[PDB]
Amino acid sequence: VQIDRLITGRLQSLQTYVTQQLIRAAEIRASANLAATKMSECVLGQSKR
Amino acid sequence: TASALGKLQDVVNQNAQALNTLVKQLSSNFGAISSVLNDILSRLDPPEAEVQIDRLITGRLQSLQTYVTQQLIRAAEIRASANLAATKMSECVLGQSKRVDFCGKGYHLMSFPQSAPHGVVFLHVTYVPAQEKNFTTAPAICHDGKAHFPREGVFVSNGTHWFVTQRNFYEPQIITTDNTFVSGNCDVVIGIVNNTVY
Amino acid sequence: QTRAGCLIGAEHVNNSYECDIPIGAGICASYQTSQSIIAYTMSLGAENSVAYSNNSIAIPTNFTISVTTEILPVSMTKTSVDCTMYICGDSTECSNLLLQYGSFCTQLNRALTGIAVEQDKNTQEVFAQVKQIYKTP
Amino acid sequence: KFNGLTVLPPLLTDEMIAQYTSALLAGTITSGWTFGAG
Amino acid sequence: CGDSTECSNLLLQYGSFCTQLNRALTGIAVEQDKNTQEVFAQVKQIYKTPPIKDFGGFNFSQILPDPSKPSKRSFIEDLLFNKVTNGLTVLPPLLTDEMIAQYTSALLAGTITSGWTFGAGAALQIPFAMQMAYRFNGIGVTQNVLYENQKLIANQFNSAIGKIQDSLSS
Ligand SMILES: *[C@@H]1O[C@H](CO)[C@@H](O[C@@H]2O[C@H](CO)[C@@H](O)[C@H](O)[C@H]2NC(C)=O)[C@H](O)[C@H]1NC(C)=O
Ligand SMILES: *[C@@H]1O[C@H](CO)[C@@H](O)[C@H](O)[C@H]1NC(C)=O
Ligand SMILES: *[C@@H]1O[C@H](CO)[C@@H](O)[C@H](O)[C@H]1NC(C)=O
Ligand SMILES: *[C@@H]1O[C@H](CO)[C@@H](O)[C@H](O)[C@H]1NC(C)=O
Ligand SMILES: *[C@@H]1O[C@H](CO)[C@@H](O)[C@H](O)[C@H]1NC(C)=O
């Protein structure tokens, strides 16, 4: 009877952790793409932007 | 080979996999006497079916919440890709773009769109120089004590005579007054060399 | 032995090539010729040097056109799910318990409807920016 | 497919899509860039 | 569940939650290496610099690699590197810092020896004092407005690099 409480707690904490991580990675990806854009457009040439 | 269109296959694979998991989830018991609801309702009284069915309700609730959350997260990648595609279409098809390595990998002339299932494909036409030769250069020339500089292109010399050429396609021309403009005097610049102008 | 762990059934080589399959820490593996699985340190490419000095340039004399494809995904399959048919399976004994959890299923439908409305915006804004249907001569 | 899960069709059909892309391809060839500005 | 069969017998009632959590984490972990690969690796051949440093007076010894120490990372790179510091596991990255430090140096030698050309076909050598006479022409300043006052500009450049070191040191 008791062990189901611990299981339903820990599984929810783990789901919350994964849900944080997915958002944080999806944020990092846009900075990675902006870095790669600057690399490609402003080092290898002169940009009038 | 069809491996060219790998990208827009994995969106379908991921969607089908998620939907198959969401549907297969129904087979689990969550601690009830059966996964089948009529199997309970036929064998047991409402005082007990109302104890049992809450577990299945909570399970299927949290499963559908997890599915909806995953879809809500995944949608923003597709939106950012649609916006990037709209940008490429607005900027590189309707006009010539100077953003290096934005359209293809080289000097860009034009592009053409083609449709595809749940996607789009571009064809980029690009110009690239293949052959190149060795030349000797000087950044200016001296005549009558005045330093001459080129209006466009650069000075080059195979070793015997001096010529001016455009920068990206070898084409020699006789150094003539209206190819060049005058600044300062011979003493100020380094590397300048004596020559004749016509 | 590697930084990543212990690898069984591959033969190390001092040579190096492009990387077909990655293992980690620069360690890479492949199937090659008398055929076996090898592992090696991934190469970064050829090595080159330019003869740079004052008063020397190279000018290109010839050129080639080229073409290059690019592929992007602009849409997703607009699935839809009935919350109460799934949860209760058209059982009234179920639904008179389910209606204690209030508006959850309805906001779920609302979320999915947003998806179903957003995706045909995605298809609408990429194409359909020409005001007239031209035709070829 | 009988558990209340369903799929909906798109608003644009693939022939409208190919009309759009054929109008674009005829425009970029006949009139260059100008058909975009005006 | 912590290595207890009394727990493990009951855990599998909840079906496949752990499987989709594992597929989530494994989908995350791979993406970082594609990010890294995309950000760098924009060059197909590893260039290297000649031994002499005839750059028209411009000083580049602060950013070029230092071969003496074992890792090829330059001085400013080593200041930047110095300034920052149950079933849980950590996986190593794919590309080691020596690879990044080769890539960067190749990009540098390309940008210095051949200007922009190395990004669109084979690189071509050009004297630096004629690269600057191009990049000044890109903003409407006639190239001679450099050849007249080249040396002063070099000095200002040499000075502007210096302060950055103190900015990183302090
Ligand atoms: C460098 O190029 C010049 C220009 O072509 C060469 O000069 C020509 O030489 C031919 C020899 O048959 C003469 O017929 C032309 O009248 C010359 N042109 C001029 C403008 O004088 C020169 O020989 C080349 N030098 C080398 C070493 O190849
Ligand atoms: C130009 O001359 C240099 C120095 O001899 C040589 O290394 C190079 O191969 C020659 N050709 C080109 C295209 O640079
Ligand atoms: C690499 O080559 C050296 C000498 O050529 C040899 O001694 C060594 O055994 C080789 N590496 C391995 C893993 O055998
Ligand atoms: C640069 O030019 C000078 C003379 O102007 C010369 O002595 C030096 O060797 C040249 N540098 C080279 C060829 O690398
Ligand atoms: C080089 O020029 C020849 C004709 O001079 C041409 O046929 C060829 O396509 C050009 N490009 C190459 C060889 O890459």
State whether residue B53 is helix, strand or coil. Answer: helix
The tokens for D15 are 């022939």
Taking the centre of ligand 1 as the mean of its atom positions, its distance from the CA of residue C57, in whole angstroms, is 20
H/E element, C122:
helix C104-126
The tokens for B126 are 């690009």
Contact B113, B120 (CB under 8 A): yes
The tokens for C94 are 């179920």
- CA separation for the pair C102, D22 (Å, rounded): 51
Closest Cα to atom 9, ligand 2: which residue?
C51
Contact B138, B191 (CB under 8 A): yes
- CA separation for the pair E45, C45 (Å, rounded): 6
Contact C69, B175 (CB under 8 A): no
Q: How far apart are the first and last CA of chain C?
A: 68
Q: Supply the DSSP string of chain E, one letter for each residue.
A: --S-HHHHHHHGGGTTHHHHHHHHHHHHHHHHHHHHHHHS---SSEEE--SS--STT---TTTS--SSSSS---HHHHHHHHH-------PPPSS-HHHHHHHHHHHHHHHHHSTTGGGSSS-----HHHHHHHHTGGGT--THHHHSSHHHHHHHHHHHHHHHHHHHH-
Per CB-CB distance under 8 Å, the chain B contacts of A4 are 31
Contact E24, A20 (CB under 8 A): no
- Contact between chains at A7 and E7 (C-beta distance less than 8 A): yes
Contact C72, B77 (CB under 8 A): no
SS3 content of chain B, % helix, strand, coil (to 5): 40, 25, 35
Contacts of B166 (CB under 8 A, 6+ apart): B152, B153
- CA separation for the pair B166, B152 (Å, rounded): 7
State whether residue D37 is helix, strand or coil. Answer: helix
Query: Tokens 């699985």 appear where?
Result: C37
Closest-approaching ligand to the CA atom of C62: 5
Q: Is the CB of C62 under 6 A from ligand 5?
A: yes
Per CB-CB distance under 8 Å, the chain C contacts of E114 are 50
The tokens for B109 are 């002339």
Q: At what angle do helices E150-169 and E75-83 cross, to 10 degrees?
A: 30
Q: At what angle do helices B46-88 and C104-126 cross, to 10 degrees?
A: 20
Residue C58, phi then psi, degrees to nearest 5:
-125, 130
- Contact between chains at D30 and C134 (C-beta distance less than 8 A): yes
State whether residue A12 is helix, strand or coil. Answer: helix
**Number of neighbouring beta carbons within 10 Å of residue E39:** 19
- CA separation for the pair A21, C128 (Å, rounded): 37
Closest Cα to atom 6, ligand 5: which residue?
C62
State whether residue A45 is helix, strand or coil. Answer: coil
State whether residue B111 is helix, strand or coil. Answer: strand
Contact B119, B12 (CB under 8 A): no
From which experimental method does this structure derive?
A: cryo-EM
CA B76 to centroid of chain Cα atoms: 18
The tokens for B129 are 């120089």
Sign of CA dihedral B81, B85, B86, B91: positive
Residue B64, phi then psi, degrees to nearest 5:
-70, -35
State whether residue B84 is helix, strand or coil. Answer: helix
The tokens for B22 are 């969401």
E149 closest CA partner among E57, E52, E53: E57
Q: What is the number of residues in chain B?
A: 198
Taking the centre of ligand 4 as the mean of its atom positions, its distance from the CA of residue C54, in whole angstroms, is 6
* Distance set, CA B139 to CA B49, B84, B161, B191, C86 (Å): 94, 43, 15, 7, 79
Pairing of strands C36-41, B154-157: unpaired
Contact B154, B167 (CB under 8 A): yes
Residue C71: beta bridge partners?
B121
The tokens for E45 are 């051949």
Extended strands (E) in D1-38: 5-7
B97 closest CA partner among E90, C66, A49: A49
State whether residue B168 is helix, strand or coil. Answer: coil
- CA separation for the pair A45, E115 (Å, rounded): 8
Query: Tokens 């200002």 appear where?
Result: E156
- Contact between chains at C57 and E48 (C-beta distance less than 8 A): no
Resolution of the model in angstroms: 4.0
In A, what residues contact B, Cβ < 8 A? 4, 15, 19, 22-23, 26, 30, 40-41, 44-45, 47
Q: Supply the DSSP string of E63-77, one letter for each residue.
A: TS--SSSSS---HHH
Q: Where are the alpha helices (DSSP H) in B44-163?
A: 46-88
* Distance set, CA B192 to CA B58, B134, C96, E96, E113 (Å): 86, 20, 96, 47, 22
Q: Which residue of C has its CA nearest to E126?
A: C57
Interface of D with B in 9-38 (CB under 8 A): 14, 17-18, 21, 24-25, 28, 33, 35-36
Contact E125, C56 (CB under 8 A): yes
* Distance set, CA C105 to CA B62, B65, B68, B69, C95 (Å): 11, 10, 11, 14, 12
Residue B113, phi then psi, degrees to nearest 5:
-95, 150
Contact E20, C19 (CB under 8 A): no
CA B110 to centroid of chain Cα atoms: 16
Residue D27, phi then psi, degrees to nearest 5:
-70, -50
State whether residue B116 is helix, strand or coil. Answer: strand
- Contact between chains at B113 and D14 (C-beta distance less than 8 A): no
- Contact between chains at B139 and E129 (C-beta distance less than 8 A): yes
Contact C130, D23 (CB under 8 A): yes
Contact C126, B82 (CB under 8 A): yes
Q: Any idea what DSSP says for residue C135? A: -
Sign of CA dihedral E157, E158, E159, E165: positive
Q: Supply the DSSP string of C10-77, one letter for each residue.
A: -EE-S-----SEEEETTEEEEEE---EEEEEEPP---EEE----SS-EEEE--EEEEEEEEEEE----
State whether residue B154 is helix, strand or coil. Answer: strand
**Number of neighbouring beta carbons within 10 Å of residue B118:** 18
Extended strands (E) in chain B: 107-116, 119-129, 132-135, 141-143, 146-150, 154-157, 162-165, 180-183, 193-194
Q: Any idea what DSSP says for residue C86? A: H
